[PDB]
Ligand binder design. Structure first.
Ligand SMILES: Nc1ncnc2c1ncn2[C@@H]1O[C@H](COP(=O)(O)OP(=O)(O)OP(=O)(O)O)[C@@H](O)[C@H]1O
Ligand SMILES: Nc1ncnc2c1ncn2[C@@H]1O[C@H](COP(=O)(O)OP(=O)(O)OP(=O)(O)O)[C@@H](O)[C@H]1O
Ligand SMILES: Nc1ncnc2c1ncn2[C@@H]1O[C@H](COP(=O)(O)OP(=O)(O)OP(=O)(O)O)[C@@H](O)[C@H]1O
Ligand SMILES: [Mg+2]
Ligand SMILES: [Mg+2]
Lengths: 337, 357, 553, 394, 287
C-alpha cells in the first residue's frame, strides 16, 4: 500500500492550483450577487485547464459565504451541453432545477422568459447548444441583461471565438504548473525526478495524472526510466510501428505509391497507376505477379488501418489513393533496416 | 445437377456434419446461368438442412429483408440490432444445436442499402454465436464489396461458366421426350453450334431448344440423318434477332431538326463525328432550316410552334435546358436516320443529298 | 335561339355518334382486347402485356380507358387499374396506386387520408379477397403512357413485378402512338421479353377524320354545309397543323355557331316542313333579306314580272317561291351525296388519285372548281377508258352491290335517275357501255348531279357558310401575320423600319445616335423597343453593351 | 472419426475461446492488469486495443474477461456490457442496450430522464461494470458523441467503477475523438497487436492443426509436425505469409484443406494444402471474363483499342460500335455482324457486371487491366483466331 | 387623336357575342399593337360590369399567381385565402363551385406573359380554372413567344378564341412600370469607357466601386489610400506592381472615373465621382 496509495490519488483530485483565476471568478459572481443584478461570463481554454473544477470550487466557497450571510443567498444551477442528446432539453433542465418542474422545451422557454421578465447558472460546454438559428444562446445571454432578471451566467467552452459567432480565458498548463499539481498531492512521499519529466507537455492536466498513474503500473509490474516507458506507450505514433510490421507485399505497395508520387509529385494517384508500379517492384524482388484480386486486398488492409485514404472499393481501377502518413515518415519506416 | 459435381464436393464437405460449425460466411460468384442457386437449393433441400432463401432485390429495405429472414425461421424488425436479438431468441429443439443457413441472393444489392448490414451478416456467427452460415451469391466480384473499415473476409467460391460441352450434357440429354436421346443430342449439338458464340445463357438456350425442336424433326414425320442443313438458316434467323404516322409540316420540322443534328455550324451557308451524337439547335436555326428546306413557305401559325412544342413533348426532340425553352432552346434531335429516310421517301424529299457526311 | 336548339341537337347527336363509333372502332379492337386477353387467358417471373398503338391523340381516348375500367370490370374477368407515367416519378407511387387501385377496382361498382397505401395489398386482394377464385383475374395494368415512364422506374417495376409474378399474372395495356421499335428502345430487351407482348393496333386521328367527314359533315341529315375556304382552312388546320378531331370538332361548332349568327336567313335551314313552318313565321324584314342576297338576286336575274315583285313587294308569291327555292335546294343536295359516294367507289379504286383519294377529297375538289374544267379529271377519264375489262366490271358491280346498297339502305331516293343507272348496270353484268355509263357519270351525273357550290340553286348561302377569315383569326391564331404586316405596314412603323434597317447588332451609342442620324423623339423608340421586348421583336440583350437584339427572325 | 473436424471447425471457423496466445504476452499483461484493477479495486480506467483486422483483439479481450470472472468475488460483484458499432448505430439504441444487458429493464420506461447522462448514471447507481465497445471506430461517428463523452466523463469524475475498453483497427482512431473526449479518454492506453516472424508463423500453422490432449490424437500430431517442414508446404505458407501475416487468413487456408480430409483421406498432405491455396489465389475479375460471349469480348477489345488510341479517355457506345464495325469490315460477308440493339444488350451486360463504369450519351471507362485481357484471351476456351489477331493489332 | 375611339367602339359589338362564347366554354383573346385598357376597362364598364369580375394586371409585378388565387379568393370570392397547395385550393374553391352552380366569374388578364404567370404550374392553374367552366378568361398578349409557352395540353385547357384586336392605344399604365436606362456620367458611357480596357483594369474598377458602395452610409469614409487599395488589388491578383496600378488610376482619372481628396494626413484618398445608383446598376450588369 506504499506506492499503491499513489494510484488512489491520481484519478480525481482537489484543491485547485489555479489561484489567480479563482479569485477573478469569485469577484465576478460576488459583484453581480452583491448588487442584486445579472450578468454573463464566457470562459475559454484547452480541455484540461481546470475550468469547471475552478468554477465548482468558487461555488462551494460562495455557498459557505452564503451561510455566514457574507453574500446574498443562494440558489445555483448547473447543466452540461454534452450530457444532452437534443440541445433543447436545456430549457427542461433549468426549469426542473427551479420550481415549475417538468414541461416541454417550448413551454419551459416561455416560462423562463416569464421568470426573467438571484440565481447562478453554470452552462458547461455550450458549444453543443449551437443550432442553425442559435435561439438558445441568444436567450441565455439575453436573459441576464433584463431589468427584472437577476441571473448570473457562467459559460464554459474550449474556443475563444464562440461568443463572436464579460469574458475570461484559461491558458494551457506550463512546465512548472503541471510539475506543481503532481507533487501537490504526492504528500504520501514528500520519486520526484519523474514529476518534472512528465511535466513537459501540451497542455492538458489529465495527461499528467493518467501518465504518471501508468508509470506506477510499470514500476510495480518510480524513476525517470519508468515514465519514459509510460509516455512511449501513449504518445508514441503507431503509424511507423505498423509500417515496420506490415507484410512483404504491403511494403512493396507503399513503395509503389512512393514511386508514383515521385513521378507525378501530387498527393493523389489511381490504384491503376499504383498497380503498375507495384508490378514493377514485385518483378524486381523475385516475387510472384501481384494478382489484382490480391492487390485489392492489400490496398484494403492498408486502408482499413488508415495508413491510406482510399476511395470506395466499387470504383475498382479508378480508386484514388492518398497517403495518411507523410512520405518522409514512410521512407523512415521502410529504410530503417 | 450435372457438371457442377466438383463444386458440390467443395460446398458439401464445407457443410460437414450439421451439428458442426461451418464458415461464418461464404461468397459464391459466377454468372446468371452458372447454376449457383440450383445447386444451393438442392443441397439444402435434399439433406435436409434448415435454411432460408431471400432475394435482395425483392427486399430493398431493412424492415422487409430482415422481417423475411426472421419470419421464414420456423416479428416486427427495423434495425440489424434486433435481428441478432430475435435470431438468437429463435432457438428450439429444431434449431438448438445445428448449423443454420441464410442464403442471400443477389447480395450485390446489399451494397446499396445500409452501411452496417453487409458487415453484420459476414460476422453474424459470432455476433449471435448461434452457429449460423450466411451464404452470399452474386454476379459481382468480391473485390467490389469491401468497405472502408473492413469486414470478416468470407470464403470466395467460384462457380465457373458452363462450357459448350457442359451445356449440351445439361441441356440435351435430360429431356429427350419423344425420341432417342441420341437424336435430341444431335439436335442440341446443332443448336449450340449456332447460338453459342452469342448467347451462353443456359436459360435462354433451353428456350430455343424447346422452340425450334418441332421444325427440326418435321422432316422425320414427313419422310425425308443430317438435318443440320434443314434448321440452320432458321436458327440463324433467330440468332441475330432474339410506322409512325406524322403530319406534313411536323415531318418537315423533324427532318429539318435531323438535318440540323447531322450537319452543324457554318455549313448552313452552303447547304441553305456521327458516333459522337446529335448536336444542339437554337429554335431560330431550326425554323430557318425549316423554311429553307420547306420550299412551300407557309407563314408561321401558333399551331406550328405548337407542333414543335408537341414534337419535343413526344420525346422525338429533347432539349438539354428544359427550363430555357422559350429563351433559347438548345433542342436536340433523337431519332434518325432510317426514320428520316422513310419520311423523305414518303414525302419524296431526299435526306441523303443534304447530308454532308 | 332556334339555331342553338338545333346546335345542341346536332352537336350532341354528333359527339354521341362520335363516342359510339368510337365505341365500335373500339368494339372490334376491344372485342380483340378481351379476345386477345382471353386468348392468353385461354392460353414464371414473366409479365405478359398488351401493346396498343393510339396515334398522337390524348383526351379523346381517356373515354375508353374509363371504359376499360368499366368494360374489363364488366366481363367478371379482371379488376383493372391504370398507372399513368407522369403520376409516377418514383418507385413508390406505382405500387401505392397498384394496390390503391385494385382495392379500389373492388369499390366503384357497388353503387384514410390517401397517404396510407403501399406495395402490399394487391398481393393480398387476389390473395385475401380472393386467393382462391379459382380462375385468376387479370389485372390489366393500363400503363396509359409507358413512353414517359421513368426508365429506372420502368425496369425496377418490370423486374420487381416480373420477379414477383404468376401469383399475379399481370397484363398491362400500352397507350402508344409509334411502332414497336420505340418500345424496344425505352423498354429494354430483357423487358421486351418479360412483356411477352403481342402487338396490337388502335385507330388514329386521320382515319376518324376521313370517316367522320364522309359520315357527319357530308351527311344529308343536317342541312349545314361549308364553303370551300373554311373547309380548306379547317382541313388545313387538321392536316397541316393539329391532328385532333377535338380541334376540328370544336372548330366545327365554332363554324356551326359562327355561321348561325350570320343572319336569320338560315331559320329556313331545316327540313322542308320544319323550314316551311318558319316560312309561315317569316316577316317583312326577312322578306327584304331574301330580296337581297345573290343566287337569289341571280335567281331574280334570270326570271319575270309582277311575278318578280310579288317576290320583291308582295311577299306571298315569294314565300311560295321560297318553297320553290328551298324544296329544290334540299332536293339537289340529296341528288349530290347519293352521287358523290357513287363517284368514290368508282375513283377511290382508281390510281394516280389526281382528283382525289378519300371521300372528303372528292367533296373538296369537286366543290372547289369545275371538275370538268379541271384537267386532272379528264386524266381520270383517260384512266377509266384505259382500265376497262374486269377490274372495272368487278369494281362497278361493287358500285352497285355497294351503291345500290346505299339506295337500298344508306339513302332513300327514289330519285328515278338512280334507278335508271341501276338497271343499266344490271344489264351490263349480264366500253361505250363503260363510256356511256361514265358519260352518264359525266353528263347525267358530273355535268348534272355532282355540280358545284356556286353553280347550284338560289340561296346556296347560309346553308353553305362563307366568311372563313374571321375564324382563322379566332382559331388558327395567326398573331404574327397581323403584327408583322402591321409593324412593317408611324413612329413605331418607322421604328420597326430601323429595327429592320441598321445591320445586325446596333450599338446604343451609335444606335441612340444612328437613330439620331436617321431619326420627345427618343422616348417612343424606347417604348417601341421595350414593347418589341414585350412584343418580342427584340430582346434586352447583353451580347454587347447597351443593346437590343431580336430572337424572332 | 470425424472428431477431428468438430474440433478444428470450432477453432478455424468459429473463434475458439481457448487457444494458444501468440506474441500477445505483453499486451495481455496490460489488459488483464487493468481488468483486475477495475474489478477487484474501485478504480476506473479506459483503454483501446488497436490492431489490423483479423489479428488480436476479440480473442484477447475474451480470454482476459474469462480469467477475470473465474474469481468468485468477481463473478458475483462484476457485470459486463458488450457493445458493437454494427449492432448499435445510435447512442439511443446503445442506452437501451446497456439498460438491457444490466438487467435494469425495470426502470421501467416510466421515468424518461432529463439528460442522457442522468439516465446513464441512474443505471449504474442501481458495483462495477466493464463496458466493451467493439468497432469503436463507429461509436466515434455518432452525431455529437454522447456515449463516448459521457462514458469517459463517468469513467473519470463520477467515481463509479467502470471499465471502457474499445476495440478498433484504425491507427487514426485518436484523431476521430473530439478534443474533450480525447482528454477524458484515459490518455492513450493503447495495445497494439500487429504481426510476427515467419518461423513463428509456421509454428502457429502446426499448432492450430494439431489436437490437444483431448493414441489417435498422438498419431495425428506426429503427421502435422511432419508437414511443418516441407519444401512445398513452406513455399506455400511463405506466399501466404508475404500477404497475410495474419492468423485468420491462415485459418481459412487450413479449413479449405480440412475438407480434403475424410474417412478415405485420414490426414492432410502437401497436395491438400496446395489445392486449398489455389482456390484463394484466383483472380476474381479474370474468372468473370472467362464466361463472356465472344460478342462481349470483341467489345472489350474495341474498348482496349479505344484506350490505346484516344489515350485513356472515356468512351460511349457509338465509338465502340464504330471500332467494332471496323473489325467485321475485313470480310464482305457477315459473320460477327449483329444488330445495334443486340450489341448494346451485351454492352449493357458488361456494365451490369461492373466491368465498365460511367461518369450513347454517357461516357464510360474500362475496368480491366490489359494484362488481364491478354491473359484471358490466351485462356479462353473457344477464342477464334480472328479476335486474337485483332487483339494484337494495337 | 380621332381614329382610335371608333375602333375601340367596333370591338364593342363583338362584346355580347363574346359573352355567348363565354357561355359556350371558350375564352377570347386580343392580339393588339396597342393597349386594350380603354377597351378592356370599357369591357369592365360596358360588358363585364355586373359583379364577379376579377382583374389582375400582368404588367403589374405586384400581383402573383398565389396572390392571384388569393386576390380572386380573398375579396371577390370572399371564401378564404387560397390554401397552401394550389391544387388543394382549387379543390376547395371547386367543391364550392361544383356544389354551388351557375356562378359565372369573368376574369381579364392584361399581359399573361408575366411573371409570375410564367410557371407551368401557374398556367396549369389558369389552365384548370379557365378550363373550369364557371369562370372565364379574356387575356391580352404582347410577347411574340406568348403562343410559344402554350402547349397542346394548355391550348386545349385554354380554348382560345383569337381576335384581330389590332389596338393602337398606348401602353401608358403598361408603360409606366417598365424602366429603361436613359433615366454625373450615365451607365452606358461608363460601360463604353470600360469595355476597351483589360480584364484586370475592369476588376480594379469593380473593387473600388464595391468599397464605395458598402460604406456609402458612413460620412467618415473618404475612400481608400493608394497603398491600401494596392494591397487589396494585390490580394485579388488584379495588379502585381506599383507602376501598373498607378498608371491604371491615372488612365481612370483622365476619363473622370476617379477623384482624389487629400485627407488630414496629406494622403490622397480615392473616390469614384459617379452617382452610387449608377455604380450599383453597373455592378448588377457586370454579373
Ligand atoms: N490544478 C489542478 N489540480 C488538480 N486537478 C486538476 C487541476 N487541473 C485540472 N485537473 C484535473 O481536471 C479535472 C477538472 O476538470 P476541468 O476543470 O479541466 O474540466 P473542464 O476544463 O471544464 O473540461 P473540458 O475543458 O474538457 O470541458 C479534474 O478531475 C482533475 O483531474
Ligand atoms: N446442371 C443443370 N441442370 C439443369 N438445369 C440447370 C443446371 N444449371 C443451371 N440450370 C438452369 O438454371 C436454373 C438455376 O438457376 P441458377 O442456379 O443459374 O440461378 P443463379 O445462378 O443463382 O441465378 P443468378 O446467378 O442469376 O442469381 C435452373 O432452373 C435451370 O433452368
Ligand atoms: N495472437 C493471437 N492469439 C490467438 N489467436 C489469434 C492471434 N492472432 C490472431 N488470432 C486469430 O485470428 C482471429 C482474430 O479474431 P479477433 O476477432 O480476436 O480479432 P479481429 O479479427 O482483428 O477482430 P475484428 O473483428 O475487429 O477484425 C481469431 O480467430 C484468432 O484465433
Ligand atoms: Mg467543463
Ligand atoms: Mg473483433
Amino acid at each position: 500500500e506504499a506506492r499503491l496509495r499513489l494510484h488512489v490519488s491520481a484519478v480525481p483530485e482537489s484543491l485547485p492550483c489555479r489561484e489567480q483565476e479563482f479569485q477573478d471568478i469569485y469577484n465576478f459572481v460576488e459583484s453581480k450577487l452583491l448588487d442584486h443584478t445579472g450578468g454573463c461570463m464566457y470562459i475559454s481554454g484547452v480541455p484540461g485547464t481546470g475550468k469547471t473544477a475552478t468554477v465548482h470550487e468558487v461555488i462551494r466557497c460562495l455557498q459557505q459565504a452564503a451561510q455566514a450571510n457574507d453574500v446574498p443567498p443562494f440558489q445555483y444551477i448547473e447543466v452540461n451541453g454534452m450530457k444532452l442528446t437534443e440541445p433543447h432539453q436545456v430549457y427542461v433542465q433549468i426549469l426542473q432545477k427551479l420550481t415549475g418542474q417538468k414541461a416541454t422545451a417550448n413551454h419551459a422557454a416561455e416560462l423562463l422568459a416569464k421568470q426573467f421578465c438571484t440565481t447562478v447558472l453554470l452552462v458547461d460546454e455550450l458549444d453543443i447548444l449551437w443550432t442553425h438559428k442559435q435561439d438558445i444562446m441568444y436567450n441565455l445571454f439575453d436573459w441576464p441583461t433584463h431589468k427584472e432578471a437577476r441571473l448570473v451566467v457562467l459559460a464554459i467552452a474550449n474556443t475563444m471565438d464562440l461568443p463572436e459567432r464579460t469574458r475570461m480565458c484559461f491558458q494551457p498548463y506550463t512546465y512548472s504548473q503541471l510539475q506543481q499539481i503532481l507533487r501537490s498531492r504526492l504528500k504520501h512521499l514528500k520519486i520526484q525526478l519523474v514529476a518534472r519529466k512528465v511535466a513537459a507537455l501540451s497542455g492538458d492536466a489529465r495527461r499528467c495524472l493518467d501518465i504518471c498513474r501508468r508509470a506506477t503500473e510499470i514500476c510495480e509490474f518510480v524513476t525517470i526510466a519508468h515514465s519514459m516507458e509510460a509516455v512511449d506507450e501513449m504518445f508514441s505514433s503507431s503509424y511507423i510501428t505498423a509500417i515496420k510490421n506490415s507484410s512483404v507485399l504491403e511494403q512493396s505497395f507503399l513503395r509503389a505509391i512512393l514511386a508514383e508520387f515521385r513521378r507525378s509529385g501530387l498527393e493523389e494517384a489511381t490504384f491503376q497507376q499504383i498497380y503498375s508500379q507495384h508490378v514493377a517492384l514485385c518483378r524486381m524482388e523475385g516475387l510472384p505477379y501481384p494478382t489484382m484480386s490480391e492487390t485489392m486486398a492489400v490496398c484494403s488492409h492498408l486502408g482499413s488501418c488508415r495508413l491510406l485514404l482510399v476511395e470506395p472499393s466499387r470504383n475498382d481501377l479508378l480508386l484514388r489513393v492518398r497517403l495518411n502518413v507523410s512520405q518522409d515518415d514512410v521512407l523512415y519506416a521502410l529504410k530503417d533496416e | 445437377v450435372l457438371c457442377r459435381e466438383s463444386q458440390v464436393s467443395i460446398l458439401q464437405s464445407l457443410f460437414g456434419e450439421r451439428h458442426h460449425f461451418s464458415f461464418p460466411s461464404i461468397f459464391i460468384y459466377g454468372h446468371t446461368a452458372s447454376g449457383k442457386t440450383y445447386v444451393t437449393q438442392t443441397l439444402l433441400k435434399t439433406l435436409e438442412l434448415p435454411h432460408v432463401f431471400v432475394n435482395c432485390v425483392e427486399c430493398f429495405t431493412l424492415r422487409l429483408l430482415l422481417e423475411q429472414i426472421l419470419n421464414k425461421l420456423n416479428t416486427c424488425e427495423t434495425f440489424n440490432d434486433f435481428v441478432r436479438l430475435f435470431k438468437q431468441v429463435t432457438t428450439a429443439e429444431n434449431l438448438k444445436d445445428q448449423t443454420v443457413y441464410i442464403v442471400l441472393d443477389k447480395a450485390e444489392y446489399l451494397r446499396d442499402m445500409e452501411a452496417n448490414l453487409l458487415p453484420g451478416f459476414l460476422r453474424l456467427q459470432e455476433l449471435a454465436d448461434r452457429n449460423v452460415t450466411v451464404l452470399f451469391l452474386s454476379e459481382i466480384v468480391w473485390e467490389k464489396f469491401r468497405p472502408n473499415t473492413g469486414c470478416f473476409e468470407p470464403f470466395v467460391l467460384y462457380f465457373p461458366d458452363y462450357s459448350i460441352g457442359n451445356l449440351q450434357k445439361i441441356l440435351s440429354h435430360d429431356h429427350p421426350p419423344e425420341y432417342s436421346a441420341d437424336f435430341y443430342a444431335a439436335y442440341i449439338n446443332i443448336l449450340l453450334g449456332v447460338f453459342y458464340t452469342v448467347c451462353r445463357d443456359l436459360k435462354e438456350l433451353r428456350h430455343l431448344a424447346v422452340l425450334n425442336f418441332p421444325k427440326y424433326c418435321e422432316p422425320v414425320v414427313k419422310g425425308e440423318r443430317k438435318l443440320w442443313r434443314n434448321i440452320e438458316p432458321h436458327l440463324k434467323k433467330a440468332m441475330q434477332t432474339v410506322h409512325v404516322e406524322l403530319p406534313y409540316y411536323s415531318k418537315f420540322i423533324l427532318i429539318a431538326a435531323y438535318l440540323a443534328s447531322y450537319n452543324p455550324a457554318r455549313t448552313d451557308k452552303r447547304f441553305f463525328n456521327h458516333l459522337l451524337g446529335p448536336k444542339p439547335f437554337p429554335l431560330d436555326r431550326l425554323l430557318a432550316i425549316l423554311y429553307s428546306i420547306v420550299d412551300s413557305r407557309v407563314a408561321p401559325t401558333a399551331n406550328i410552334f405548337s407542333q414543335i412544342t408537341s414534337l419535343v413533348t413526344l420525346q422525338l426532340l429533347t432539349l438539354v435546358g428544359h427550363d430555357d425553352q422559350l429563351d433559347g432552346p438548345k433542342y436536340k434531335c433523337t431519332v434518325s436516320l432510317d426514320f428520316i429516310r422513310a419520311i423523305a421517301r414518303t414525302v419524296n424529299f431526299d435526306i441523303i443529298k443534304y447530308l454532308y457526311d | 335561339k332556334l339555331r342553338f336548339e338545333t346546335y345542341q341537337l346536332i352537336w350532341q347527336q354528333m359527339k354521341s355518334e362520335n363516342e359510339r363509333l368510337q365505341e365500335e372502332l373500339n368494339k372490334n379492337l376491344f372485342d380483340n382486347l378481351i379476345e386477345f386477353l382471353q386468348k392468353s387467358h385461354s392460353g414464371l417471373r414473366e409479365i405478359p402485356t398488351a401493346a396498343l398503338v393510339l396515334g398522337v391523340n390524348v383526351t379523346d381516348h381517356d373515354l375508353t380507358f374509363g371504359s376499360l375500367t368499366e368494360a374489363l370490370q364488366n366481363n367478371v374477368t379482371p379488376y383493372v387499374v391504370s398507372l399513368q407515367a407522369k403520376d409516377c416519378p418514383d418507385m413508390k407511387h406505382f405500387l401505392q396506386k397498384l394496390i390503391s387501385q385494385l382495392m379500389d377496382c373492388c369499390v366503384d361498382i357497388k353503387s384514410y387520408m390517401t397517404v396510407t397505401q403501399k406495395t402490399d395489398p394487391k398481393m393480398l386482394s387476389k390473395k385475401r379477397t380472393t386467393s382462391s377464385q379459382w380462375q385468376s383475374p387479370p389485372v390489366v395494368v393500363i400503363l396509359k403512357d409507358m413512353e414517359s415512364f421513368a426508365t429506372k422506374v420502368l425496369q425496377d417495376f418490370i423486374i420487381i413485378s416480373s420477379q414477383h409474378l404468376h401469383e399475379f399474372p399481370l397484363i398491362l395495356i400500352f397507350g402508344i402512338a409509334t411502332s414497336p421499335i420505340i418500345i424496344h428502345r425505352l423498354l429494354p430487351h430483357a423487358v421486351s421479353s418479360l412483356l411477352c407482348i403481342e402487338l396490337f393496333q388502335s385507330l388514329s386521328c386521320k382515319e376518324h377524320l376521313t370517316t367522320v367527314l364522309d359520315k357527319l359533315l357530308l351527311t344529308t341529315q343536317f342541312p349545314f354545309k361549308i364553303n370551300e375556304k373554311v373547309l380548306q382552312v379547317l382541313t388545313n388546320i387538321f392536316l397541316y397543323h393539329d391532328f385532333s378531331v377535338q380541334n376540328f370538332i370544336k372548330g366545327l361548332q365554332l363554324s356551326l355557331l359562327e355561321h348561325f349568327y350570320s343572319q336569320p336567313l338560315s331559320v329556313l335551314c331545316c327540313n322542308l316542313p320544319e323550314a316551311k313552318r318558319r316560312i309561315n313565321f317569316l316577316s317583312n324584314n326577312q322578306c327584304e333579306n331574301i330580296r337581297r342576297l345573290p343566287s337569289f338576286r341571280r335567281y331574280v336575274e334570270k326570271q319575270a314580272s309582277e311575278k318578280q315583285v310579288a317576290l320583291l313587294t308582295n311577299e306571298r308569291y315569294l314565300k311560295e317561291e321560297t318553297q320553290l327555292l328551298l324544296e329544290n335546294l334540299h332536293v339537289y343536295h340529296m341528288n349530290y351525296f347519293l352521287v358523290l359516294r357513287c363517284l368514290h367507289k368508282f375513283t377511290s379504286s382508281l390510281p394516280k388519285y389526281p382528283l382525289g383519294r378519300q371521300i372528303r377529297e372528292l367533296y373538296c375538289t369537286c366543290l372547289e372548281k369545275n371538275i370538268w374544267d379541271s384537267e386532272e379529271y379528264a386524266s381520270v377519264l383517260q384512266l377509266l377508258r384505259m382500265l376497262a375489262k374486269d377490274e372495272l366490271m368487278t369494281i362497278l358491280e361493287k358500285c352497285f352491290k355497294v351503291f345500290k346498297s346505299y339506295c337500298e339502305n344508306h339513302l332513300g331516293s327514289t330519285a328515278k335517275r338512280i334507278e335508271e343507272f341501276l338497271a343499266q348496270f344490271q344489264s351490263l353484268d349480264a366500253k361505250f357501255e363503260v363510256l356511256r355509263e361514265n358519260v352518264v357519270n359525266f353528263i347525267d351525273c358530273l355535268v348534272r348531279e355532282y355540280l358545284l357550290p356556286p353553280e347550284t340553286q338560289p340561296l346556296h348561302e347560309v346553308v353553305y357558310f362563307s366568311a372563313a377569315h374571321a375564324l382563322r383569326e379566332h382559331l388558327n391564331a395567326a398573331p404574327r401575320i397581323a403584327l408583322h404586316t402591321a409593324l412593317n405596314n408611324p413612329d413605331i412603323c418607322i421604328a420597326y423600319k430601323l429595327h429592320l434597317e441598321c445591320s445586325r447588332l446596333i450599338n446604343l451609342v451609335d444606335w441612340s445616335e444612328a437613330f439620331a442620324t436617321v431619326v420627345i423623339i427618343h422616348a417612343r423608340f424606347i417604348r417601341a423597343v421595350s414593347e418589341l421586348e414585350l412584343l418580342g421583336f427584340i430582346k434586352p440583350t447583353k451580347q454587347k453593351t447597351d443593346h437590343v437584339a431580336r430572337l424572332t427572325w | 472419426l470425424s472428431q477431428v473436424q468438430r474440433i478444428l471447425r470450432e477453432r478455424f471457423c468459429r473463434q475458439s475461446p481457448h487457444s494458444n496466445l501468440f506474441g500477445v504476452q505483453v499486451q495481455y499483461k496490460h489488459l488483464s492488469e487493468l481488468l483486475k484493477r477495475t474489478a477487484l479495486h474501485g478504480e476506473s480506467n479506459s483503454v483501446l486495443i488497436i490492431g489490423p483486422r483479423g489479428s488480436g483483439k476479440t480473442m484477447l479481450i475474451n480470454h482476459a474477461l474469462k480469467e477475470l470472472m473465474e474469481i468468485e468475488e468477481v463473478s458475483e460483484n462484476v457485470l459486463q456490457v458488450h457493445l458493437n458499432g454494427l449492432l448499435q448505430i445510435n447512442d439511443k439504441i446503445a442506452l437501451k442496450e446497456i439498460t438491457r444487458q444490466l438487467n435494469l429493464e425495470n426502470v421501467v420506461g416510466d421515468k424518461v430522464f432529463g439528460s442522457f447522462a442522468e439516465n446513464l448514471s441512474f443505471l449504474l447507481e442501481a458495483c462495477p461494470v466493464i463496458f466493451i465497445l467493439d468497432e469503436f471506430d463507429l461509436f466515434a461517428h455518432h452525431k455529437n458523441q454522447t456515449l463516448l463523452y459521457n462514458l469517459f466523463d463517468i469513467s473519470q469524475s463520477a467515481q463509479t467503477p467502470i471499465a471502457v475498453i474499445g476495440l478498433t483497427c484504425r491507427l487514426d482512431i485518436l484523431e476521430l475523438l473530439e478534443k474533450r473526449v480525447k482528454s477524458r479518454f484515459s490518455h492513450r492506453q493503447i495495445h497494439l497487436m500487429n504481426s510476427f516472424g515467419f518461423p513463428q508463423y509456421v509454428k502457429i500453422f502446426k499448432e492450430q492443426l494439431s489436437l490437444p490432449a483431448e493414441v489417435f490424437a498422438e498419431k495425428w500430431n506426429e503427421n502435422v509436425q511432419y508437414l511443418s517442414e516441407d519444401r512445398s508446404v513452406q513455399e506455400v505458407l511463405q506466399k501466404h505469409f508475404n500477404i497475410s501475416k495474419n492468423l485468420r487468413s491462415l485459418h481459412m487456408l487450413l479449413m479449405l484443406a480440412l475438407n480434403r480430409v475424410t474417412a478415405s483421406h485420414p490426414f492432410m498432405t502437401a497436395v491438400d494444402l496446395m489445392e486449398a491455396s489455389q482456390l484463394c489465389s484466383m483472380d476474381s475479375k479474370a474468372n468473370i471474363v472467362h464466361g463472356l460471349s465472344v460478342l462481349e469480348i470483341c467489345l472489350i477489345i474495341a474498348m482496349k483499342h479505344l484506350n490505346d488510341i484516344y489515350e485513356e479517355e472515356p468512351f460511349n457506345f457509338q465509338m465502340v460500335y464504330n471500332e467494332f464495325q471496323k473489325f467485321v469490315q475485313r470480310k464482305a460477308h457477315s459473320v460477327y455482324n449483329f444488330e445495334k440493339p443486340v450489341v448494346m444488350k451485351a454492352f449493357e451486360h458488361l456494365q451490369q457486371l461492373e466491368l465498365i463504369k460511367p461518369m450513347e450519351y454517357q461516357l464510360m471507362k474500362l475496368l480491366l487491366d490489359n494484362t488481364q485481357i491478354m491473359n484471358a484471351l490466351q485462356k479462353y476456351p473457344n477464342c477464334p483466331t480472328d479476335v486474337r489477331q485483332w487483339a494484337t493489332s494495337s | 387623336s380621332a381614329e382610335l375611339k371608333q375602333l375601340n367602339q367596333q370591338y364593342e359589338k363583338l362584346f355580347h357575342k363574346w359573352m355567348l362564347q363565354l357561355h359556350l366554354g371558350f375564352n377570347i383573346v386580343l392580339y393588339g399593337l396597342g393597349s386594350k385598357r380603354d377597351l378592356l376597362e370599357r369591357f369592365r364598364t360596358t360588358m363585364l360590369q355586373d359583379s364577379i369580375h376579377v382583374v389582375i394586371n400582368g404588367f403589374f409585378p405586384g400581383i402573383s399567381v398565389k396572390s392571384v388565387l388569393n386576390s380572386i379568393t380573398e375579396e371577390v370570392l370572399d371564401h378564404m385565402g387560397t390554401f397552401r397547395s394550389i391544387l388543394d385550393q382549387l379543390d376547395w374553391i371547386v367543391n364550392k363551385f361544383k356544389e354551388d352552380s351557375s356562378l359565372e366569374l369573368f376574369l381579364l388578364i392584361h399581359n399573361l406573359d408575366s411573371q409570375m404567370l410564367r410557371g407551368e404550374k401557374s398556367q396549369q392553374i389558369i389552365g384548370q380554372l379557365s378550363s373550369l367552366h364557371n369562370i372565364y378568361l379574356i387575356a391580352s398578349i404582347d410577347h411574340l413567344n406568348a403562343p410559344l409557352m402554350w402547349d397542346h395540353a394548355k391550348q386545349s385547357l385554354f380554348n382560345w378564341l383569337w381576335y384581330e384586336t389590332t389596338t393602337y392605344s398606348p401602353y401608358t399604365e403598361e408603360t409606366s412600370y417598365e424602366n429603361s436606362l436613359l433615366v454625373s456620367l450615365p451607365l452606358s458611357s461608363l460601360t463604353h469607357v470600360l469595355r476597351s480596357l483589360t480584364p484586370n483594369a475592369r476588376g480594379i474598377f469593380r473593387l473600388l466601386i464595391k468599397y464605395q458602395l458598402d460604406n456609402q452610409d458612413n460620412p467618415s469614409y473618404i475612400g481608400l489610400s493608394f497603398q491600401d487599395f494596392y494591397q487589396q488589388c494585390r490580394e485579388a491578383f488584379l495588379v502585381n506592381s506599383d507602376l501598373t496600378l498607378r498608371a491604371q488610376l491615372t488612365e481612370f482619372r483622365d476619363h473622370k472615373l476617379i477623384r482624389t481628396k487629400k485627407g488630414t494626413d496629406g494622403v490622397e484618398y480615392l473616390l469614384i465621382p459617379v452617382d452610387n445608383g449608377t455604380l450599383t446598376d453597373f455592378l448588377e450588369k457586370e454579373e
